[PDB]
Design a protein around this ligand. Structure first.
Ligand SMILES: *[C@@H]1O[C@H](CO)[C@@H](O[C@@H]2O[C@H](CO)[C@@H](O)[C@H](O)[C@H]2NC(C)=O)[C@H](O)[C@H]1NC(C)=O
Ligand SMILES: *[C@@H]1O[C@H](CO)[C@@H](O[C@@H]2O[C@H](CO)[C@@H](O)[C@H](O)[C@H]2NC(C)=O)[C@H](O)[C@H]1NC(C)=O
Ligand SMILES: *[C@@H]1O[C@H](CO)[C@@H](O[C@@H]2O[C@H](CO)[C@@H](O)[C@H](O)[C@H]2NC(C)=O)[C@H](O)[C@H]1NC(C)=O
Ligand SMILES: *[C@@H]1O[C@H](CO)[C@@H](O)[C@H](O)[C@H]1NC(C)=O
Ligand SMILES: *[C@@H]1O[C@H](CO)[C@@H](O)[C@H](O)[C@H]1NC(C)=O
Ligand SMILES: *[C@@H]1O[C@H](CO)[C@@H](O)[C@H](O)[C@H]1NC(C)=O
Ligand SMILES: *[C@@H]1O[C@H](CO)[C@@H](O)[C@H](O)[C@H]1NC(C)=O
Ligand SMILES: *[C@@H]1O[C@H](CO)[C@@H](O)[C@H](O)[C@H]1NC(C)=O
Ligand SMILES: *[C@@H]1O[C@H](CO)[C@@H](O)[C@H](O)[C@H]1NC(C)=O
Ligand SMILES: *[C@@H]1O[C@H](CO)[C@@H](O)[C@H](O)[C@H]1NC(C)=O
Ligand SMILES: *[C@@H]1O[C@H](CO)[C@@H](O)[C@H](O)[C@H]1NC(C)=O
Ligand SMILES: *[C@@H]1O[C@H](CO)[C@@H](O)[C@H](O)[C@H]1NC(C)=O
Lengths: 346, 224, 370, 197, 49
């Protein structure tokens, strides 16, 4: 039987209080999905795949193809809107001064490293390495598939069957530029860059502001500055060590990748089913049978594949709604945690 | 003959179809030899007719090539057409002609009836375990074969070796009994029975079945 | 036309996609020269009885299925799985011709999924049958005055028949507790009974000659293929191909797939043909579908201008089948009609991977990408 | 004699899984939260539990809302009496009115009626000659029965897909409500909220 | 019914992806309860007075 937790009994009495005599600085990590993969489906190539008879029989089923394409385009635009509204919250791209003394606080593993081509920090590189993300056929997937390789790829099969992955509008370098600007603005101005123009202030004074915000007198910071800086640096190092050893912390983003891979894999594998026909190969049907019987079998295949495509679109719509809710939460957390100091508990 | 029971150790996997697949896990449903089954080791020294139930997996590690053919049928007489496979030093011959053999058919190394089929080819048999699978499906006597360099003659190896189809004979006869052939101027062979099973077959980049999972063996394989 | 409107707002719209059209057709069939002997199957003096139905194997010959109408006077050509019209296009590995003579009432029992006296004791067809059944009246051949008792059928059997299974034993059927021991009496029935065929019976009891042609859709090399001639082999070009009745469209490339000698075709995840073996010369060819991709139209509002850029999504700029003189290579596709500028503005019409297009001045109004 | 609908649901392959946490465990969590709040305030949510008298905790709450400590320390008996009367009123209202938990009653009823509709959808023919698979198989032969069985399969698959989609949407709504409840527990219970209403 | 099962095997993986979706819903129900209630780390108890 599962254990809820350790038993505790608070020593409560009507003339006793408990007051702390020391403190600690903790750096926790919160991971939030923002956007998922943008996909488009060629319904005619998926259902028929270069077959005039199948296309002419599909023409009689109405605007199902057009409304599926409309829903997928709406999802694809919504993903870019989510990324824009989460990251693009600062009007000016701030940059940190060449000097790197902020009262003993390091900020060396989160500020960008210009030696790398992409201006991403150490922790950002650790996250990008820990998330096993596929290329999703961005740079000329058809040109890559044209290379005669003995091992056929799942992305190649999806591309050949008509499922395409669109690239996002904002590149990873642009996202890193947004995060670097937000970090530099926070470090050099506090919350003042979130309510107008950035006002420079020493970081010790900013932390004194924070201490007064949480209800602690600022002389505590001005007398324990070195200890607080050491605790912050140790917490940052512990974050680095936890990221460089355990890879299961990014399970949410890994699931975001895995669901979008599995949906396309299932949609591709659904092309091999018969749906009550005599064969799952349209050309085999058209070569074996005459006009009327071929039309009957092709109609069965068309109905089955249309139902499968509609199921995929509905699942993607629900998943996109969930991702949009997560992105709204992430935008609120960027507005309140980063651009200011939050009094909301937990 | 002397009978000793032993374990299959994941033996008898064959190619289910003549279609190339590479780097994929394919789920098939066919007459397979179940994993860790109870096979029978026969020692014949110089012989009741064995049953033929849903196919037979045959294995032999005999380097002396005393085993040199098979007889299949229902009653193994002149009344019923009996298939016969004979491998001599030059060719292999498959005939449906019934010889009206005795109760202990054998070949004499030291120096008929109705004939509707005859097929001549290259020797099936060249520390070398030879494996065959015979099964009658829709009037087809399908034969799969494999050769493997074995280390211990008594020990059936733990490993995988997909059997490739040799011939597809459209004999179309009722087979329920069978027997083997020995050359006389000592022999030991393994016999097992196939069953309808669902297998998960793993193909590598070269299209070779390097691994297989029997779905009905145990809950872990069912989960797999 | 896509938007069903006469006014188009500013933006990018996904228009219908594009395909690279095939050039010519390739037909590739095995090299065979013989003719299939349907004369011995149809023009025969006497067909065997249903309980001992005759079987002939047809292989390694060219089959012309439109010739069969002259040999026997039958109305239709009933087929399951195939159609009599298309039989000359696709070709099979082996053919099996079964011949017998039945009554007019038992013609309907020769079909997959059918049960009855004949289908249970004399001739059972598989439920996955793929072939044709031919039946024609033979009242002028198999009927004589006083009865033609040369045709027999089985009424009694302990069990049923497996598909394509033949029974020949004439043993005394025991319908009771006491053994028969070779004596036919009381409940000891002889299973073979004779059709009593008279010319004076009705058309329902008249004899009917039946020939069943069963085709084999195996993956072994095909031996029975029709009279369609074969053309030469063209590689590295988008063409239609017909390999042993397998029709498709794509590009055939020289492959390094290590096909085992018993393997002919190769399959994909979606159970489509990916690699074929040429029947004339035993080589392996990969099949890749011809070039395609998405098409998007980037336009400002029709209230402003009618100039349009086109984005080919998923296509390298050197692989476009064809259009302005400004061709730009983006990470989302190939953009034709918009000149890339080195400046940077806010995003007006997004394209992908950080590229945005807008209708702006130059000196003088044109579409630029940045 | 009173034939249960749950037996039909179970006999048609529609089962219900038990929750992971029992009601005793839920009550233990609520007891732990309530005792921690009573004996420590927000300190147990901010870190380790720090004991403090309840009158002084009320004084802290009054300073949080903007009223000085002397108001509490001079009206402590009146405030305690008002709190006790409010608790008694809540108890009486819950004992009297049975329509307060309408949201939870709807949560139960939606799943109950969804399973009932899924079970009752098995009686439809969907164009076939009969809604009983055994009757179809006993009447028609293989070829003529396969079409009717295909009709029944398509109809029942469509019904099951509709059920799954509606359950997915309902689950999304319930997840949004659960996130709101988690935020309310974090902010209203484990601390004092300045957010209006 | 064996005939109906064999006819149903031709319809692909609808019959398994509905199961996958239902399993996801059933898991997130316990996730919701775990998130809402189990926010404290220790089981505190009140003094007897
Ligand atoms: C508050 O806690 C810190 C630890 O976070 C204490 O700092 C440690 O003090 C001991 C003894 O002086 C040293 O050996 C350690 O090296 C210190 N650790 C660090 C990280 O500096 C600090 O002394 C505590 N304050 C009080 C008043 O006890
Ligand atoms: C900020 O952290 C970095 C990384 O830990 C520190 O840089 C390292 O410093 C150590 C000695 O302190 C050197 O041995 C390493 O070579 C440095 N680089 C790396 C990549 O580890 C840096 O000194 C810290 N700065 C402050 C002010 O604490
Ligand atoms: C403030 O209101 C409370 C009630 O809300 C008043 O307390 C009541 O006072 C009357 C008369 O003294 C008593 O009969 C009641 O029993 C009291 N109610 C309770 C709940 O104790 C209180 O007197 C008011 N204060 C002022 C200054 O008007
Ligand atoms: C205060 O607590 C003590 C012991 O904890 C108890 O004896 C006393 O009665 C309490 N005060 C009042 C007013 O009850
Ligand atoms: C095979 O069956 C025989 C039958 O008696 C038994 O003795 C033998 O142990 C079995 N082999 C096993 C279980 O490996
Ligand atoms: C093997 O048997 C065949 C059967 O005809 C015969 O032709 C051949 O000569 C034999 N080879 C020998 C005896 O070495
Ligand atoms: C061989 O076939 C003939 C023709 O039917 C038959 O008369 C003879 O008995 C057969 N010989 C056998 C079966 O040994
Ligand atoms: C295929 O075989 C070659 C040589 O036989 C080998 O080098 C290669 O590794 C094999 N591919 C596999 C095992 O995936
Ligand atoms: C058919 O033509 C091919 C191509 O020249 C040739 O290799 C083959 O031998 C021919 N077949 C026959 C039976 O002549
Ligand atoms: C059938 O073919 C034969 C060829 O041997 C021919 O003599 C005969 O006239 C044809 N027609 C009939 C009805 O036998
Ligand atoms: C064929 O063999 C099976 C084996 O069970 C038997 O039941 C059947 O009667 C046999 N048929 C003939 C025609 O010998
Ligand atoms: C396009 O084709 C050229 C020439 O074949 C090649 O160098 C390039 O990598 C391809 N892809 C892109 C994105 O240019």
């Amino acid at each position: 039987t599962m254990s809820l937790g350790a038993e505790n009994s608070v020593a409560y009495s009507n003339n006793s209080i408990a007051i702390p005599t020391n403190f600690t600085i903790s750096v926790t990590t919160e991971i939030l999905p923002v956007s998922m993969t943008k996909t488009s489906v060629d319904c005619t190539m998926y259902i028929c795949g270069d077959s005039t008879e199948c296309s002419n029989l599909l023409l009689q089923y109405g605007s199902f193809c057009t409304q599926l394409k409309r829903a997928l385009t709406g999802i694809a635009v919504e993903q870019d809107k989510n990324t824009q509204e989460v990251f693009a919250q600062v009007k000016q791209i701030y940059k940190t001064p060449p000097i790197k003394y902020f009262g003993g606080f390091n900020f060396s593993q989160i500020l960008p490293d210009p030696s790398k081509p992409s201006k991403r920090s150490f922790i950002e590189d650790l996250l990008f390495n820990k998330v096993t993300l596929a290329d999703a056929g961005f740079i000329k997937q058809y040109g890559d598939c044209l290379g005669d390789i003995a091992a056929r790829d799942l992305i190649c099969a999806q591309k050949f069957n008509g499922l395409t992955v669109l690239p996002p509008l904002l590149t990873d370098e642009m996202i890193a530029q947004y995060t670097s600007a937000l970090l530099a603005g926070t470090i050099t101005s506090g919350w003042t860059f979130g309510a107008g123009a950035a006002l420079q202030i020493p970081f010790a004074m900013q932390m004194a502001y924070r201490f007064n915000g949480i209800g602690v007198t600022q002389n505590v910071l001005y007398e324990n500055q070195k200890l607080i800086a050491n605790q912050f640096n140790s917490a940052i190092g512990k974050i680095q060590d936890s990221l460089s050893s355990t890879a299961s912390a990014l399970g949410k983003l890994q699931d975001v990748v895995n669901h979008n891979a599995q949906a396309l894999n299932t949609l591709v594998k659904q092309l091999s089913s018969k749906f009550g026909a005599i064969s799952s190969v349209l050309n085999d049907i058209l070569s074996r049978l005459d006009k009327v019987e071929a039309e009957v079998q092709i109609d069965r295949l068309i109905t089955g594949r249309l139902q499968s495509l509609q199921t995929y679109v509905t699942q993607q719509l629900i998943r996109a709604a969930e991702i949009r809710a997560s992105a709204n939460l992430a935008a609120t957390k960027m507005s309140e945690c980063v651009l200011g100091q939050s009094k909301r508990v937990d | 003959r002397t009978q000793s029971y032993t374990n299959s150790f994941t033996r008898g996997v064959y190619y289910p179809d003549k279609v190339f697949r590479s780097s994929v896990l394919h789920s098939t449903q066919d007459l397979f030899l179940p994993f860790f089954s109870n096979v029978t080791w026969f020692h014949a020294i110089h012989n009741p007719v064995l049953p033929f139930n849903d196919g037979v997996y045959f294995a032999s590690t005999e380097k002396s090539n005393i085993i040199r053919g098979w007889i299949f049928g229902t009653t193994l007489d002149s009344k019923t057409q009996s298939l016969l496979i004979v491998n001599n030093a030059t060719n292999v011959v498959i005939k449906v002609c019934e010889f009206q053999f005795c109760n202990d058919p054998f070949l004499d190394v030291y120096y008929a009836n109705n004939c509707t089929f005859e097929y001549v080819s290259q020797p099936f048999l060249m520390k070398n375990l030879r494996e065959f699978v015979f099964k009658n499906i829709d009037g087809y006597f399908k034969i799969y074969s494999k050769h493997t360099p074995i280390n211990l003659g008594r020990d059936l190896p733990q490993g995988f070796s997909a059997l490739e189809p040799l011939v597809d004979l459209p004999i179309g006869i009722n087979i329920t009994r069978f027997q083997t052939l020995l050359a006389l101027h000592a022999a030991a062979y393994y016999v097992g029975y196939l069953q309808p099973r669902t297998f998960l077959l793993k193909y590598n980049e070269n299209g070779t079945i390097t691994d297989a999972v029997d779905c009905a063996l145990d809950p872990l394989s069912e989960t797999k | 036309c896509t938007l069903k409107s006469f006014t188009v707002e500013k933006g990018i719209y996904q228009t219908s996609n594009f395909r690279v059209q095939p050039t010519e057709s390739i037909v590739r069939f095995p090299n065979i020269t013989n003719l299939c002997p349907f004369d011995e199957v149809f023009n025969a003096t006497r067909f065997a009885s249903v309980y001992a139905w005759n079987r002939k194997r047809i292989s390694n010959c060219v089959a012309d299925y439109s010739v069969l109408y002259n040999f026997a006077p039958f109305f239709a050509f009933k087929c399951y799985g195939v159609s009599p019209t298309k039989l000359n296009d696709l070709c099979f590995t082996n053919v099996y011709a079964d011949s017998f003579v039945i009554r007019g009432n038992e013609v309907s029992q020769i079909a997959p999924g059918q049960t009855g006296n004949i289908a249970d004791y004399n001739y059972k067809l598989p439920d996955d049958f793929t072939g044709c059944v031919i039946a024609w009246n033979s009242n002028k051949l198999d009927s004589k005055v006083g009865g033609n008792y040369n045709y027999l059928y089985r009424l009694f059997r302990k069990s049923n028949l497996k598909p394509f299974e033949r029974d020949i034993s004439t043993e005394i059927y025991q319908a009771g507790n006491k053994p028969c021991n070779g004596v036919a009496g009381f409940n000891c029935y002889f299973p073979l009974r004779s059709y009593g065929f008279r010319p004076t019976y009705g058309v329902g009891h008249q004899p009917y000659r039946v020939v069943v042609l069963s085709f084999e859709l195996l993956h072994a090399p095909a031996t029975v293929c029709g009279p369609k001639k074969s053309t030469n082999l063209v590689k590295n070009k988008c063409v239609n191909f017909n390999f042993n009745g397998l029709t498709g469209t794509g590009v055939l490339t020289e492959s390094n797939k290590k096909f085992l000698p018993f393997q002919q075709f190769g399959r994909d995840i979606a159970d489509t043909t990916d690699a074929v073996r040429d029947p004339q010369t035993l080589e392996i060819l990969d099949i890749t579908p011809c070039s395609f991709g998405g098409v998007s139209v980037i336009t400002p509002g029709t209230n402003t201008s009618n100039q349009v850029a086109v984005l080919y999504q998923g296509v390298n700029c050197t692989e476009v089948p064809v259009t302005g003189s400004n061709v730009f290579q983006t990470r989302a596709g190939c953009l034709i009609g918009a000149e890339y500028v080195n400046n940077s503005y806010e995003c007006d019409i997004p394209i992908g991977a950080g590229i945005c297009a807008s209708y702006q001045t130059q000196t003088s109004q044109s579409i630029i990408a940045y």
